[PDB]
Each structure stands twice: as structure tokens, then as C-alpha cells.
Design a protein around this nucleic acid. Structure first.
Lengths: 106, 193, 173, 204, 130, 251
RNA sequence: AUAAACAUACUUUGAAUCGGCCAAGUCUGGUAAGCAGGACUGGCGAUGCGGGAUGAACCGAACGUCGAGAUAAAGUGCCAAA
RNA sequence: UGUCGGCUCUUCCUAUCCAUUUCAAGCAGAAUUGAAAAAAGGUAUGAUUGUUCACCAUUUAAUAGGGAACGUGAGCUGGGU
RNA sequence: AAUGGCUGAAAGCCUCUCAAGCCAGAAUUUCGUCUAGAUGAAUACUUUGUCUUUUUCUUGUUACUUUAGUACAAUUGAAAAUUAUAUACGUUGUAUUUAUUAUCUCGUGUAUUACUCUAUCAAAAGGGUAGUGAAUACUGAGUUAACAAAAUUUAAAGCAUAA
């Protein structure tokens, strides 16, 4: 109906050269090209909506979501840190997430 | 050191028309036309009116300009100016390269095609192989006297290379070149008019 | 780079305590400036920290940091061969500004790190006294040149998109 | 959402390595890339130097079985795939999937010839190169090493330029009439209320 | 020949920094990379400072009778004498500066109005041409 | 250490791997380079080897010391009955090689050609080219054929004729034909298609393709030998008689 | 001057060990050795962790199970976080 | 971890013996000598010795020097050790 | 390639270029040619025309049989070249994902289209002509929404006939 979100790319987890900490996920919000535009998005909602091909004998929904929040910037290029209720599956790397306009402060 | 500005100019005589299109100079004179390309990414070529004599009036010139640039790049300004000066001279008083055939024992016969676009050197040092030596476009060979020819044309680069191609084809091999003074040599290079 | 005005006195048997040493030291801060002052005193007057007292370490600020001046620097540096005395000229508006240029230039052309260069003195010369082959072309009144091959300028990092749209072009500015 | 549209990169007047580095990073970010005219990319060094590098590259080869050895592709569309594949993860599903969304063609083929082309400013040869530095088109180097289809491409590109010449001329005629027709609506008095709104915000 | 030159008196526009999209006047050329812009602080608010040439853009105007090392008092006299402010706003880049200022204070309602209005006008102009 | 004495390697590395072919017929890897300044003509044929005889030929070269009465030489006899041209195909030059655009066939096709498209003919329904022949003269199909001709004339560079043999004229027990594409080298693509269309359903004899005292190239599959050792395959030196475990191998 | 009460002084009984190896603003024999032998200290052995692509010794720093932050050596075109 | 040489066979290096292209000479010609590009192709037959090595007799355009666990023993031989 | 040269500055002369630009030059390199060969293309016949999964027949494959589920024509995506760019302007300052004013009905014709479809001429075309519908502009008027719901993306079973 209407677009009320900004597409964000799940680049990967907060890691080191030979380590990886899947508790914090890194996102690239479309339109943020510097760390001085991130303060708007600190605290906004983020959802990882995905589709599962359920069977006709299951009541499990075909559309599910994992929700989280943006907590801090990550480097001088407008990359963010997002903490989710359940850590995103690494099979979802490079996929698109939703950055909502709420909880609004405007 | 880097020169802030290096510039050169070439005076355009009356019977010469010059037009420039992105470092591409076409010169038209009484003897014809001559189009050359100068693909240096740091040189600006434009025609203006300048006073070059110490007390003379204004005149049409072509200005070759290179701004801030090291001494390796700066040297190309006078190279391009010489080429444009050569082209202006070429279409006004074309170039001619007089060569003389030198032999010790075996006479050499030169066979020139009717159109003058090719030559043929025969019996050079008694060799049964006959040299052909094609000529570049716009260069014509003719026979002045005995054992002497001359190449005419508008482009000095084409006339000089074609003359050198004749000499390069008649080199003595596996012999004392200090003793076997043979071949065709450029006696002098001069203008037709 | 900052300039400092440092003074001290020596209280011992060898040096009478009525002689005050002054200097102007260029250093990133006052701690480094004092170190350059104490070593200058020790290597030239046998004065050591444990037998001397520091008095002033106030900074020196440029009086008119809006006037373009041709600075001349007399320095000595140490190379693989030996020790040499050099004289370089720079065009800047502050004394500490020209010294920043001197240190960067020396480390580039001569591959000399900062801890081999001693700045003897820095002065100001006239327009026609600049003998630098490149810098002599800008001291005149009628300098003029077009900056060609300009890369288009970005206002800020906000508009620094990775992939652009359409063709690209330089500027004749 | 899902990125189904394809980013088209016109590889004309770009650097081979700097295009690959930007393309390789964004392949991992889920984007879909199609680099057309991958034969017009430029590399540093004259043709003689490029051949020395190529001849050194051709040396690496399995002694006991050259058919197992390094395969030295000579097509420029394969000189960019090799460059991109070097910058992508090796021996995992993440690397294979990222490379699955990449294509070079030696020209603009049928579906990608009428698509919105993009450019990579970091990889432009006019920014990262001293103009005096001599370069080499990947197509010219390909011919010198044994790429047979260099003149087939030059025929196809020539017919693409001439077909886009008539489309552009017809489009410029229509767009001029549409622009002049709009100026009559702007000057019209019935649309005065709407025009004032546009003038207020500078759109007119 | 090149049209716009980096010289003394040339009017330049600061493309980045705290004074982005503000006019300035060159009054001294330190070297090939640095110039001293004193775009009159009393008029355009640009202080006398040294800037790198990678942060400015040349315009088509040169202030007449501006010499190297001009004082702020004399420079302001020549800046208003040549009427640089009026001439700059008539140029293509001057209008684009105003449009950027115009569009940044556009609320969602204002954007809604113009987006709806422009769609009809552009459609209407397309219909007119046969 | 270095080998004590030097000798050329045994066997050519230009014919590696030594893989036996699958079809008796051998396809030419290329045709002579096209020249657009001559009349269209065929650049190949196909024949069956018969045997070998010897001939005494009179020497016509000069400045040679050969006997004046004639030189004994071997010859090979290749029986070449006429071919039947049953179609043609145009190839376009792309960035991955020649690509066949369309193939246009004749109305009448012999069962020798139809036998190529099955693997058990005696059990087949033998309905090859049935729809192509039955609907050859319909208005819809005629328009389609006219488009194939014009498509080739517009977007093609190489034209070849699909000519097949007649195996009822040779003593071979095989009945299915031997199809071969013979490129047409000659004028422009316009007159190449015109010549190719004229050859449809016709017969081409070897005298039209080749001249007299003409040097040609022959491509064929050699005589099979089976599993062979290194001595026969490459020509290595047999080992001394004293050798344990065998003599005819590489040490 | 500074530190020191889970400080200090120990007594008794006993285990394993005395093949060592490395570094160096060190030395001796040797042309020299990833050679042989020494003075002082720190390590490896007995030791994982972050970095140097990989490595017994190099640099940072020594380890109960976890969460959040500021860091160290060292790095920020892609593989690879910047 | 089967320890010499020879036999068979493949490959690699160039610090090139020949063939190809060049420059130099105290290169008149012929025969030569020094040097550069170049390792894609060739570089032998025998008397004596287990020999590597060596020395002789020929032939050749040349009869170059080396590595690959001092290449190669479920590949041979067993002459030496 | 080694090397011999041409024009030619740097450096007013000279210079084969630790300069731009060219020529001649090897048992050299690459095309051409020979061998093996991946993804492929054309044609002939059998089919299918929204689609799959699991069973199941066959030496095997395709078409095929049954029970269900799902979508239903209509705004997508192109200047080229150059960058010391004929002049002028610098047209500044957010690429894809991601630019439609909720819903249905009612009203008048015109106009427009890289729109859908039909017929036709052509065609390895964001093609031509004629007609038809769609959307939009001129440009309306009215209905309804309150709690619930606004998703396919493919799951299960068989072998009569034909190639």
C-alpha cells in the first residue's frame, strides 16, 4: 500500500579478522553515507521479515519476522549496530531488512 | 623544475589556412592539405593573434600551451610547434630528399614505376635479389641524373621515412662496411620551392 | 606545531645566577618544547635539570595570521654521509605553519625523519629574495593559471554515494 | 524487500581493478550486477608492459598436466570475472552466490542495451590517473594475446551507436515540443492557481 | 583557450566546509594548491583565510581593480561597486543555490501539493503535443 | 642429473590426448578463407576410399634429374558418386563463434537422408520431414520460407549447403547417407544464397568442385588398431634381453 | 623516602629435576654456519589468546562461566571489522 | 628412506656448442675473436677402464655445461663397493 | 625483442626517445592451420501452451492418468564522444531496492502513449498501417471503511495409450 520503511542490508555480524560475535548485527541503511546521519536512526525498530513455504497441514504462518533495534553507529560510513531478539541467520546475509519510522521522536 | 607556463607559437603565412578540432590540426596551403593528430593529454592548441616581432604588428599565430608540468612533459610543447611549422612549410614549399647511389664495381640500375609510387633497385653488389621499396602516400620518386634520385612530398615525416626505407633495404651484410661503401645515401634534404 | 617562549636560570657553582637563557622552541606541545630547551642547555652550557630552574613556558601566537609572508628557514640535518646546513623558503601566513611545511618537505625529499633536523632560525624575506625554483613563480603580482582537470567537489560525506547514475565528467572549474 | 532489478555498469572509461573492488563488495551485499562493455576497461602500463605481465601469468601451469593447470582466459569479459572473483570469498556458499550475480559482455547485448547505465566514480580513469600515464584498453590487450572476437564486437558496437543516434534525434524532437507545450500551460491563466504554488517552492 | 583563471580578484564559491555555497574573492596565491580567499566578511561572511583549491570552484566574474593583499575596507568597496551579488544570482549556479534553499524547508504537505500538481501539468503538456 | 645423451622425444605432443573418434565420418575443422571477388562455388566434397594402385607418370618439371621414361608413384582411388543437395544453412559471426541462424530444406527428401534421424529404422514409423513435405506448398509455410531466405541475406556471413551421398551407387552395405556441409565461398551473401537456392534438390558432381592437377586437403579417420603398447604407440627403444618382467616398455 | 599482619621467622617429612633451547644497542674459537662455548636479564620448555598470511621463542598480554563498554600490538580499496 | 655406475625415458635451468637476427675488431676476402635478443629445435659412433673422470680414432652444422632425494633397482643389470 | 633508423624537443645547436609520435628488423609472439574439448546453436519428428512436489510404469525418457491449490492484457530500464572537452554554462548537494491521491459506482467527447490485443507489411527492430480495449489530462459527483480477514510461492496418489 505505502512504503513506511527504509531498506537495510544485513552486511554481517560484528566481527574481527578471525572471530565473529553474532550478538550484534551490522546493517547498511539506504541513504546513510556518513556517521553524522545515524543519530536519527539510533533506537528505531528493525525487522527481518522472511517467507517460509509452509504446508497446508500446518498452522504456522508463511510470513515471520525477527525484530530488533539500532543501538549505535559503526565506523564513519553510516553502518549501524542492531541487536535482535534472536540473532539473524547467517543464511540471511546480504538480504534486505526494514527500518521503521517508530519509535518516533518527531 | 615544474614550469608554471610553457608556450610556443608558429606564424601563419597568407596562403595557409589552419583549423583545429581537439588537438587535431589541418593545414591547407597552395600545394594541398596535411592533417595530423597530436594526442598529448596535457597540451592546449589554439589559434590567436600575437605580436612576435620586437616592434612588429599583430599577426595570426597558433599557440601551443602547456600549464603546470614537469620538464619531461614540458618538452612536448616545442616538439608540437616544430611539427606544425613543418606542415606549414610542407604545404607551402614542399620537401625534397636527394639521394645518391654509391657503388664500387657493380653498377646499380633504378627502375621507377610510371606513377612514381615505387622504385626498384637492381644489381646492388651483384645480388640477384631485386629490392622493391614501396613509397608512402603523397611521396613520389623521380630520377634527376645518373645515380641520383629525389623524393617529393608534402609531409617531412613521410618523405624522410620513405627515403630511409630505400637506404635500409640496401645494407651490406657480413662485410667490412668501412671497405664496402655501397648503397643509396641521402646527400641533402631541401625544399622544392 | 606550536611555538613557545621558554626561559630558565642556572643555580650552581659554575654558572652565576644572574644569567637568564631564552629561546623560541617549535614543538607539538609545551612538554616537548621544554625537552628541546633542556637538551639545548645541556649540550651547549653544561646545564642540567637537577641544577636549574624553569621560569616561563608561555606560548607565542601569530600576531597577524592573515598576511602572506615568504619565510626563510635555516636548518641543519643529518644524513648517511654527515651533517649539512640547508636553507629552505616557504610561503605561509604563520611561523608555525611554515615549520609544518618544512618538516613534511624534508621527510619527503630527503627521507629525513624529524629526529635528525635542528631548526637554527626562521626569518622573513622579501619578494625578490625567494630563490626556490618553483616558489619564485608565485611571488609576483600577476600570477595567473587555470586549474584544469578539476575533480568535482562534494559538499560533505553525506552525498558520497558509491555508485552514481549517468556518465562522469571532470571540470575546467 | 527483494532486489530484482539489475545494476548496469558501463565499463567504458573505467579502471579494471577499481571497478572490480566496488563490484565485489556490493555483490556480497545482495545486489545484482551486469557490467557491459567489459572490453573498454583500462589498466596501467603500456602494451609492452602488459604483455610481459601476461607472459608471466601464462607461465603458471601444472607441469604434470596442463589441463589441470591454471586456465588463462583471454576474453576481456573473462579478464574482469577473474579480477572480481579474486576479491570475493573462496570455497564457501557465500562466495559462489555472490559471483552468480555477475556478468560481463563485450558490448551491449539485446536486453541490456536499453537499460539505465550507472558509473563508479571511484573507478573513473579521469580521477585516479595522471593524464600523462599511459594506459591500455582491455580489448586491445585481448587481441594481442589471442582474443579472436575483437572485430566482431567493433561491428556490433558501430551498429548500436547508429541505432541510438536516430532514437535520440527523434526523442529530442518530441521532448522539445513537450517542453514548449508546457510553457504554454504555465503561462495560461486557468492554471494560475497551480502555477503560483510551483513558483512559491521554486519548481517553476 | 581556458576561460576562468585562478588569479587575484577572481570570484570563487566555497563548495565545502562551514561556508559551503558562499561567495569569496581571491586576494593572494600562496602556491599552486593554496589561495587566500577574503570574500568580504562584512558582505558574504567568509573570513580572511587560506583554503585549498580542491574546496572551491571558479566563477565567471573577476572583481576589477583588486590587487594582491587587498584590505577588507578597500575590498568591500570594490565588491559592491561591481555588483557581484546581483550578477551571481542571475547565473545558472546562483539559481541552483536558491533552489536548494527553497526545497529544504518543504514539509510533507508542501511536497504532497507539488508532487500532485506537477504530475497533472506534465501529463497535460504530453497530451497537447500531437 | 642431466641425461647422458640427447635424443628427440618419441611421439608428438600435438596429437595428445589420443582419443578414438565416435563417428566414421570426419568433420573438417575449417574451410578455405572466403574471397568475395569471385563467383560462388563449393569448397569440398566427400568420397569413399576404394584401394591403391601404382602409376607411371611422365615428368614435366625442368632442371631435374628424374628418369625421362617416367617415375613410379603410388595413387589412391576414391570413388565419388554425385551428391544430392538437400538444403542450406546460414551462419552468423557472433562473439562466441559462428551461430547457425536458420536451415532451409527442399520439398523432396530421400530415405537415405531420413535414416540419419533414427537409430532403429526398421522399427521407426519413418515420418521424418512428413509435416515439412506435406505442408510445403501451403501459403503459411511459403511465407515462412521467404522469411528464412531474407533473414540469412540480412544477418549472416557464412552459407553452407547440406549435401548428402547416395549409397545405392556404392558397394557398401550401409544404406543411410553421409551428410556433409560444404561451405559456399564466392560473392556477397546475396548471391551466395541465390546460388545455394539454385542447388536445392539438384546433384553436384566432383568435376564441378575440383579441377585438374589440383592440390587438395584430405581429412579422414585412420585405421583402427586397438590397445597397443608403448613400442607401437610411440616408438620407444626395446629393453635389453636380460630384462626382468618384460622388454617392450618404458623403463 | 617507599612498601610490608592472609607480614615475618621458620621447623619436619618428602616428590620431580640437574640432555635444555631462543632473543640480544653482549663476548670468545672459526671464513662462516639455523656452528661450538660463556656473563646479565627475559622467555620457550610448562602457554593458551589478539597481531605478524603461515611459525616454540617476535609485538601486545597471560586464561573460572557470561553480558556491556573503553582499549593494546597493529590496521581502515576487496578477500577483512574499520 | 635399498648405497656407485651404465641402460631406458621425461622434464627443467642458461652461465649458448650449432642453426636465426644484430653490434664491435688491430673485420680487405676466406677463416676467425669479443658482445646483445633468444632455451621453440638439435647436440653422435667406437678401442681401454666397473668406473664418474680421462685419453685416443672418426664423423658432424655442433658433437655445450648442469638440476630433478649426487632424477630413475615391486624399471633392468650386479661390473665395482 | 637485441639492433639500425625517421621526425623531434629537452638544452635556440646536437640527439633513435632514462620525451610524446613512427619505420625496418628473429629458429620470436599472436592470428590462420592441426588435435582433444565445456557451456552451446540450427533443423527433423513426438508433444505441451499457469505451474510444481510426493507416489507410481518403463531398460530408461518425454508426453500422459487422478485428487486438490494457485495467476488471469494493459504506465517496466537506452544518446554518443571528450575530459588541456569549438564558444558559453558548470547547470550546485543522495545510484538500485524506492517516486501512482484509499475504495467502488456514476458522467461528455477530444487528445496522448517505449501500454494490451487483433489483422496485415516487415523483422534475428523498445518498426510501419488500420482497428480495439487500458491508463491519464481537460474534470466532476457521490458510496463505503470503525471490530474480523486481506498471500500464492505445490502438496498428495497411478501406467491405459503414443513417440
Amino acid at each position: 500500500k505505502c512504503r513506511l520503511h527504509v531498506n537495510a542490508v544485513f552486511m554481517g555480524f560484528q566481527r574481527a579478522q578471525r572471530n565473529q560475535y553474532p550478538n550484534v548485527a551490522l546493517l547498511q541503511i539506504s541513504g546513510v553515507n556518513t556517521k553524522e546521519d545515524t543519530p536519527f536512526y539510533i533506537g528505531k525498530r528493525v525487522a527481518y521479515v522472511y517467507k517460509v513455504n509452509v504446508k497446508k497441514g500446518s498452522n504456522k504462518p508463511a510470513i515471520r519476522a525477527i525484530f530488533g533495534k539500532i543501538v549505535a553507529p559503526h565506523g564513519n560510513h553510516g553502518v549501524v549496530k542492531a541487536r535482535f531478539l534472536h540473532n539473524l541467520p547467517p543464511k540471511a546475509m546480504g538480504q534486505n531488512l526494514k527500518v521503521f519510522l517508530y519509535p518516533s521522536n518527531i | 623544475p615544474r614550469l608554471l607556463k610553457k608556450t610556443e607559437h608558429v606564424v601563419i603565412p597568407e596562403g595557409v589556412n589552419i583549423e583545429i578540432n581537439r588537438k587535431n590540426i589541418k593545414v591547407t596551403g597552395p600545394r594541398g592539405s596535411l592533417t595530423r593528430e597530436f594526442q598529448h593529454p596535457k597540451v592546449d592548441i589554439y589559434a590567436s593573434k600575437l605580436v612576435v616581432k620586437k616592434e612588429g604588428p599583430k599577426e595570426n599565430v597558433v599557440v601551443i600551451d602547456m600549464w603546470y608540468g614537469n620538464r619531461r612533459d614540458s618538452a612536448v610543447v616545442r616538439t608540437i610547434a616544430s611539427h606544425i611549422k613543418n606542415m606549414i612549410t610542407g604545404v607551402t614549399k614542399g620537401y625534397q630528399y636527394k639521394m645518391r647511389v654509391v657503388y664500387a664495381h657493380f653498377p646499380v640500375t633504378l627502375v621507377i614505376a610510371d606513377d612514381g609510387k615505387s622504385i626498384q633497385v637492381q644489381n646492388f653488389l651483384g645480388e640477384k635479389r631485386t629490392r622493391h621499396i614501396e613509397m608512402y602516400d603523397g611521396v613520389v620518386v623521380k630520377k634527376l641524373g645518373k645515380d641520383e634520385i629525389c623524393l617529393e612530398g608534402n609531409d617531412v615525416e613521410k618523405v624522410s621515412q620513405s627515403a630511409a626505407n630505400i637506404h635500409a633495404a640496401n645494407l651490406v651484410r657480413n662485410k667490412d662496411i668501412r671497405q664496402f661503401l655501397d648503397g643509396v645515401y641521402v646527400s641533402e634534404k631541401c625544399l622544392i620551392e | 606545531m606550536k611555538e613557545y617562549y621558554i626561559t630558565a636560570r642556572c643555580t650552581d657553582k659554575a654558572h652565576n645566577p644572574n644569567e637568564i637563557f631564552r629561546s623560541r622552541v617549535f614543538a607539538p606541545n609545551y612538554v616537548v618544547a621544554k625537552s628541546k630547551f633542556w637538551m639545548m642547555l645541556k649540550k651547549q652550557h653544561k646545564v642540567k635539570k637537577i641544577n636549574a630552574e624553569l621560569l616561563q613556558c608561555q606560548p607565542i601566537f601569530e600576531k597577524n595570521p592573515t598576511v602572506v609572508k615568504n619565510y626563510q628557514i635555516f636548518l641543519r640535518y643529518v644524513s648517511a654521509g654527515g651533517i649539512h646546513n640547508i636553507t629552505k623558503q616557504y610561503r605561509d601566513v604563520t611561523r608555525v605553519g611554515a615549520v609544518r611545511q618544512m618538516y613534511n618537505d624534508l621527510a619527503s625529499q630527503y627521507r629525513t625523519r624529524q629526529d635528525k633536523i635542528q631548526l637554527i632560525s626562521i626569518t622573513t624575506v622579501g619578494d625578490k629574495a625567494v630563490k626556490n625554483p618553483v616558489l619564485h613563480q608565485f611571488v609576483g603580482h600577476h600570477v595567473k593559471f587555470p586549474m584544469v582537470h578539476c575533480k568535482p567537489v562534494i559538499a560533505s560525506k553525506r552525498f558520497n554515494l558509491p555508485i552514481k547514475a549517468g556518465k562522469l565528467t571532470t571540470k575546467l572549474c | 524487500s527483494t532486489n530484482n532489478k539489475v545494476t548496469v555498469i558501463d565499463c567504458h572509461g573505467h579502471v579494471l581493478g577499481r571497478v572490480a573492488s566496488v563490484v565485489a563488495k556490493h555483490l556480497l551485499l545482495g545486489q545484482k550486477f551486469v557490467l557491459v562493455r567489459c572490453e573498454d576497461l583500462q589498466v596501467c602500463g603500456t602494451l609492452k608492459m602488459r604483455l610481459v605481465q601476461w607472459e608471466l601469468y601464462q607461465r603458471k601451469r601444472v607441469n604434470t598436466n596442463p589441463t589441470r593447470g591454471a586456465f588463462h582466459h583471454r576474453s576481456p569479459a573473462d579478464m574482469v570475472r577473474k579480477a572480481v572473483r579474486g576479491m570475493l570469498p573462496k570455497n564457501n556458499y557465500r562466495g559462489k552466490l555472490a559471483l552468480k550475480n555477475l556478468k560481463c559482455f563485450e558490448g551491449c547485448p539485446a536486453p541490456y542495451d536499453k537499460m539505465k547505465k550507472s558509473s563508479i566514480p571511484e573507478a573513473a580513469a579521469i580521477y585516479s590517473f595522471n593524464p600523462t600515464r599511459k594506459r591500455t584498453l582491455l580489448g586491445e590487450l585481448g587481441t594481442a594475446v589471442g582474443w579472436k572476437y575483437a572485430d566482431v564486437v567493433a561491428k556490433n558496437e558501430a551498429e548500436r551507436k547508429e541505432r541510438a543516434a536516430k532514437w535520440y534525434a527523434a526523442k529530442q524532437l518530441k521532448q522539445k515540443a513537450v517542453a514548449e507545450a508546457k510553457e504554454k500551460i504555465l503561462a495560461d491563466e486557468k492554471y494560475k492557481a497551480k502555477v503560483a504554488i510551483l513558483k512559491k517552492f521554486g519548481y517553476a | 583557450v581556458f576561460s576562468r583563471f585562478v588569479e587575484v580578484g577572481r570570484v570563487v564559491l566555497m563548495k565545502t566546509g562551514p561556508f559551503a555555497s558562499k561567495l569569496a574573492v581571491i586576494v593572494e596565491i600562496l602556491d599552486h594548491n593554496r589561495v587566500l580567499v577574503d570574500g568580504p566578511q562584512a558582505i558574504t561572511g567568509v573570513p580572511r583565510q587560506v583554503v585549498n583549491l580542491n574546496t572551491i570552484s571558479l566563477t565567471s566574474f573577476v572583481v576589477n581593480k583588486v590587487t594582491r593583499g587587498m584590505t577588507h575596507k578597500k575590498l568591500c568597496l570594490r565588491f559592491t561597486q561591481d555588483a557581484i551579488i546581483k550578477r551571481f544570482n542571475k547565473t545558472a549556479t546562483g539559481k541552483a543555490i536558491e533552489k536548494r534553499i527553497l526545497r529544504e524547508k518543504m514539509t510533507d504537505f508542501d511536497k504532497f501539493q507539488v508532487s500532485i500538481i506537477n504530475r497533472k501539468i506534465n501529463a497535460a503538456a504530453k497530451i497537447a503535443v500531437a | 642429473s642431466h641425461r647422458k645423451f640427447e635424443a628427440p622425444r618419441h611421439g608428438s605432443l600435438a596429437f595428445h590426448p589420443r582419443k578414438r573418434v565416435h563417428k566414421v565420418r570426419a568433420t573438417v575443422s575449417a574451410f578455405p578463407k572466403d574471397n568475395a571477388a569471385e563467383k560462388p562455388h563449393l569448397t569440398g566434397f566427400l568420397g569413399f576410399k576404394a584401394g591403391m594402385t601404382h602409376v607411371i607418370r611422365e615428368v614435366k618439371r625442368t632442371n631435374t634429374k628424374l628418369p625421362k621414361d617416367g617415375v613410379l608413384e603410388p595413387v589412391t582411388i576414391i570413388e565419388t558418386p554425385p551428391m544430392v543437395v538437400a538444403g542450406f544453412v546460414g551462419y552468423k559471426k557472433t562473439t562466441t563463434g559462428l551461430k547457425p541462424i536458420t536451415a532451409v530444406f527442399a520439398e523432396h527428401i530421400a530415405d537415405e537422408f531420413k535414416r540419419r534421424y533414427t537409430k532403429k529404422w526398421y522399427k521407426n514409423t519413418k515420418n521424418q520431414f512428413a509435416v515439412h513435405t506435406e505442408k510445403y506448398n501451403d501459403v503459411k509455410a511459403k511465407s515462412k520460407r521467404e522469411r528464412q531466405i531474407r533473414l540469412i541475406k540480412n544477418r549472416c556471413d557464412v552459407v553452407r549447403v547440406i549435401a548428402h551421398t547416395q549409397m545405392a551407387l556404392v558397394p557398401l552395405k550401409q544404406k543411410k547417407a553421409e551428410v556433409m556441409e560444404i561451405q559456399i565461398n564466392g560473392g556477397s551473401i546475396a548471391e551466395k544464397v541465390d546460388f545455394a537456392v539454385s542447388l536445392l534438390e539438384k546433384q553436384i558432381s566432383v568435376n564441378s568442385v575440383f579441377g585438374t592437377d589440383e592440390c587438395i586437403d584430405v581429412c579422414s579417420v585412420t585405421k583402427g588398431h586397438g590397445y597397443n603398447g608403448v613400442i607401437k604407440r610411440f616408438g620407444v627403444r626395446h629393453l635389453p634381453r636380460k630384462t626382468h618382467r618384460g622388454l617392450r616398455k618404458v623403463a
